[PDB]
Structures are given as structure tokens and as C-alpha cells.
Amino acid sequence: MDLKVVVSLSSRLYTDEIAKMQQRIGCILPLASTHGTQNVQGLGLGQVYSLETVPDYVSMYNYLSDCTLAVLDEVSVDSLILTKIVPGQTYAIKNKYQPFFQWHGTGSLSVMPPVFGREHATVKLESNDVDIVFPMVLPTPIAEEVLQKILLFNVYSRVVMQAPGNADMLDVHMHLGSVSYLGHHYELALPEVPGPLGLALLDNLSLYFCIMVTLLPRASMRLVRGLIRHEHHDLLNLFQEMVPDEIARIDLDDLSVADDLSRMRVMMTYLQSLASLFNLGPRLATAAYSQETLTATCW
Amino acid sequence: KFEVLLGVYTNAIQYVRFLETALAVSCVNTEFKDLSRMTDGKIQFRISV
Amino acid sequence: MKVQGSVDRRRLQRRIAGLLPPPARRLNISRGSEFTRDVRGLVEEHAQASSLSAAAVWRAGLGWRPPVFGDFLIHASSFNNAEATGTPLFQFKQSDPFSGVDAVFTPLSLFILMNGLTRMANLLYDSPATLADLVPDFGRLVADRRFHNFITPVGPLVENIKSTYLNKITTVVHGPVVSKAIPRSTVKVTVPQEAFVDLDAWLSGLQPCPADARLYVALTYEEAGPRFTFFQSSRGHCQIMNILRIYYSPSIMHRYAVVQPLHIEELTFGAVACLGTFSATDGWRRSAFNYRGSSLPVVEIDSFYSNVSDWEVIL
Amino acid sequence: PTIAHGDGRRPSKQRTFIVVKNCHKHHISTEMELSMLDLEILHSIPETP
Secondary structure: OOOOEEEEOOOOOOOOOHHHHHOOOOOEEEEOOOOOEEOOOOOOOOOOOOOOOOOOHHHHHHHHHHOEEEEEEEEEOOEEEEEEOOOOOOOOEEOOOOOOOOOOOOOOEEEEOOOOOHHHHEEEEOOOOEEEEOOEEEEHHHHHHHHHHHHHHHHHHHHOOOOOHHHHHHHHHOOOOEEEEOOEEEEOOOOOOOOOOOHHHHHHHHHHHHHHHOOOOOHHHHHHHHHHHHOOOOHHHOOOOOOOHHHHHHHOOOOOHHHHHHHHHHHHHHHOOHHHHHHOOOEEOEEEOOOOOOEEEEO | OOOOOOOOOOOOOOOOOOOOOHHHHOOOOOOOOOOOOOOOOOOOOOOOO | OOOOOOOOHHHHHHHHHHHOOOOOOOOOOOOHHHHHHHHHHHHHHHHHHOOOOOOOOOOOOOOOOOOOEEEEEEEOOOOOOOOOOOOEEEEOOOOOOOOOOOOOEOHHHHHHHHOOHHHHHHHHOOOOHHHHHHOOOHHHHOOOOOHHHHOEEEEEEEEEEEOOOEEEEEEEOEEEOEOOOOOOOEOOEEEEOOOEEOOOOOOOOOOOOOOEEEEEEEEEEEOOEEEEEEEEEOOOHHHHHHHHHHHHHHHHHHHHOOOOOOOOOOOOOEEEEEEEEEEOOOOOEEEEOOOOOOOOEEEEEOOOEEEOOOOEEEO | OOOOOOOOOOOOOOOOOOOOOOOOOOOOOOOOOOOHHHHHOOOOOOOOO
């Protein structure tokens, strides 16, 4: 019910880094194991993310969700005082990310690996030959958008192999490259080569997709095939007057409510399971916020 | 009728203190009142050659 | 000329005397004067706890964690009088008559219904046809695969007042498991050691160790009938399902014959729920049952915080 | 008694345990004889030397 964790440093502070660490007060980082005394290298995210190593971000998500998360509380010349995240406790939080994102009230926050920039969220302590890597806390919308972009890139990279360069320039860096915000645009770091352990999510995705596409309903296809041709809609701006003929080929047979209903039941049941393969991030609920202090109360 | 029972207790302590040990000749022992507050300390030797 | 030592006991006595919470207020109703005096103390305490004017009237300086008890009534055949306290139980829904019996179920009762541990379960239940009478559509609900929706987890039992036909049962629903009769003596939760798979060792830099380790529950329709499995893992709700599917793949390969291409109602391989959370870095303990034909080894885990979850589809 | 530890491990709990012994019982038996004549003449009253 009361948890205070001290991490001891063998070497000294080396004040060159302490100022940057001190304006870095009150922010999250995941620690290795829950004990009163910790090792210095297990403290940051520096273990999972080596400088020479190519980033595979689903592995970073897997490491990040497993480890306990801690609130930085105070840096001392030889000490790191951090209270941790008890699952049933409420505490304040204050954040400053160099990719700076503005929060709303009662908006759930997701914890993610620092996909944007290594120099940004990582502080090198070469005195111990270590590097403290802070994780990224974002509002849930932008979090799921960025994760989806990451997985779609991990697919289309395997796809765009041996295709015209017009595939190489466009899909690889038009939508999978940048993430927008209100009058703002942030680039992403992209894995030069497709990463293993990322598609391990995609295999399960393909499984669910096979099972779901075995049980798709019929009437919805008829409604859409009618509405694209007879009427105009903004959601139907995507489809032009021409229809993908796949829908025409599946559509051929008549309707029956008794068939649609059991398909709908099993489709609903297979839709509750996707939330496990889509979250991959510990979520924090907002209770109150002040832009004048940038200090919210997450939960 | 309520029964009250007695069961005996023993202690295996032995009186032991730091100064009464001989090791205390190795160190020099000062009592600092508020040691948790002190962040860091240092000694600065200046040696002429 | 004693040394006086290095640490002082006056400080410890003082700070601990400061740490003790004030005593609960007994109210004495049998005697008049004691009643009046405790009522005087009550009005003074409310005057001392609610007036922003003064500062000593500010008392909030320096948790309520019993469990939420829920009582179920069950027939004396659908429950052994000897079955140990704290075993997780799972509940079933009756259609019209619910007041007669609740028909709460035990893991050995599920092993019996589903058809060493077999012999123990028979030495508990020789003639378990009432067990078949509790679920009339068992043979129907194995195929309709709606069996998991109705089996809702109830978790560990604390007390069972014993009667001829009915049984009174108190069940921990949410919160840590605890008792009532005394200053809240604790209990522990037992699951048989066989038919339990440790998924943190099934695949066995350094993997990180979390604070809390969770227990999941899953229900699988194999060609050798349905079966239940509970999993002691710690990684995450997003990874336990993937690792479990990887585990079941050799059993999933066999279901090509049974599945129906026309009717899609049978396809689901199982569902996973999360029962509760316990302390990691400890493990569990080994004990056998002490009944007449008791040969089953059983794992038992301390520090169980019962936080039941729903059944989630896996395939 | 117990020692204080400074490492990362949880603090060692103070330990008091209960030790119960059993009391044995021994029996000893000796046999002795007295001839009937030795016991008879005690009741008779001797006057002549």
C-alpha cells in the first residue's frame, strides 16, 4: 500500500547530466523487478533497446507491458527515488516529452516504446556506461493510430519487395511515415528491414481474419452495393460508382434472417477478442488536468 | 465454566554491544543526529611533495 | 559504566506510540450511565471531525480490504461436506426455478461431468447422475459450445453451513479472500496439481519479473470431450492468449474433422478468463487431499486477490 | 534474536517458535521373600530368653 524504491548508483552523479535528469522529474519509466534495492541497468529501458541494434517495436511493447512502471520522484547525487504504480492507487503525474502532445480531460493514456526519436527520450549516463530510456505516454487515439501504422508498415515492407519504385516511395513513406495532429506533423522512425516478433501479432490477425471472413453476413453487402450506386455519402466517397466485383460474386444468393442471425452472433463473439490483440499497452485514465502546470492526475 | 490456561515463555537473547567488541578499535564512532538528510559528503586532502 | 549502545529505545517507543490508530468506540447499551458517556464521546468526536474552524479538528493524517461476500444455497448432493475450504467454484443458471438450488460446481465435478484423479473424483461422487440432472442440455451444450457462457466463476468459498439437503455457502467475489467469524482470519486457494499447466515454464536478455502474477481459466472442446485448464502466468493479457494458442495448436490440429462447413456455431476452440492475482517470486505449495480415497496432488497459492474476468474467445 | 540486513531482499522477520517435549515415565520393581515362619512369630509374644 506504500511503496518507495531507491536505486543506488555505483559511480558519481557527473552534474553535466543531473540538470537534464532534474527537469525530467515526475515521469514514467519501467523498472526490472520490484525490490527495495535495484540494479542500475535494469532501471531504464536501456536493456531492450541497444544502440547498435535494429529496433523491433512489438518486442519493446512486450517488454514494456511486462515490467512494472514507476514514477520518477527525485534524483540525488547517488540515489534514484521512485514510487511505483500500484494497480489500485491514485497519484499525480507531470510530463514533458520533446515530441510534445497536449492532453484532454478523462482521456485514457497509453504507454508505448519511444518510436519517434532515440535522442529525445533517452539520456546517456556514460559515467556508468548506461543510457536511461524513458517510455512514451500518449493519448489513446494517437497511440492506436501509430501502432496500426507500425503493423501496416511491417506488412507492406514484406510486400513492396521486387515492385516498381513507385511502390517504394509511396506506401512506405506517405501514410506509414508521418502522424498528424492539430496543425502539426511528426515523423516516425522506421525499421530499415522488417522486424521479427512483430508479425507474430500478424499471424494471429490472419487467423482471426480467416475465421471472420468465413462468417461474413450478406445483407450488409447488398445495402452497400446499393448505396454506392444509387446515392452519395461521405463514408462512401471511398468507393466510387464502380464496385469491387468480389462483392458482386459473393452477393449472388438471396437473404434469410435466420442465417444472418447466427453469423452475427459468432461475429460479435469474435469481435470481443480483438481488444486483446489491439491494446498491448497499460492504460491510464485521466481524472483532472491543468495546462498551466502540465500536471494531470492519471489512474 | 471457562478455563484459563498458562503456558510458559523463554528468551534466548544475549547482551551484545558494539563498543565492548574489540573491532571498535578499528573504526572511530561519531553519532550524527540526522543522517538520512545528508545527501553526500567528502573529505579533501591536500598533500605537499 | 555501560556503553548505552548505539540506538535508543525511547525514540522507537515514541514513534510507534504515535503510529497506533485510536481505538474503536464500544457503545454500552445494557447500563444507562455507560451509554450516556459513550454518546457524549460520540458528539465530541463529531465536533472534532467536521469543523474546518480548528486544526486539531483535522484528523485525516495517516485500507478497507475485506472481500465482498455473496451467499449461495446448494443441494447436499451437488457438494461434498468434506471438500476443502477455498477451492474455486463455478456457477450455473437455472431457467425457471432458481430458489430451489443454485447448483454451484467444483472442478472435480466438472471433471466428472465432462467424462488417479478419476478415481478420486469417483470416491467423492460414485453415482453422479444428479450432476447430469443439474445440466439437462450438457450433451446439447457441448455441441452448441455455449457451455462457457453459463459457467460463471464464483471463486473460493469461505464457509458452508451444513444441512440435510440444502447447503449454505459464502463466496469471495471481489477483493482478497478473508473470513468473518474471528478478527478476519485468512484463507488460501487450492487447485489440483495435475490438469494445471505452468505457462511461465512451458517455454523454458533476461526476462523481467513483474510484481503480480495472475491465474487464468480456459475451457476447450477437444475430440476427447471438453476440458478445463487454469494457467499461472504473469506477462500480460495481450500475450497470455497468444502463448496459449501456441500451446493448444497441437490439439487444434485435430479439429478439422469435427468442424461443420455449413453451420459455423461449433468452431470456437475455447475461451479464457482471468480469476485473480497473487504474489510472484514465491511459487506455490504442494499438498494432497486427506479424504478416504485421496491420492491427488494439489497446488495451493497464497495471497489471492479475487478479480474475476469474462470468457474471451480464442482460436 | 535476529540480525538486520541491508540488501535488496525483504527484511528478515523476527522468529519465535514453540518447542514441545514429552515426559518419559520409568517404573522400577524389586522382589523380596519372607518365609511363612518369619512372618508368623511376629504375632507371638516371647517371654523366656
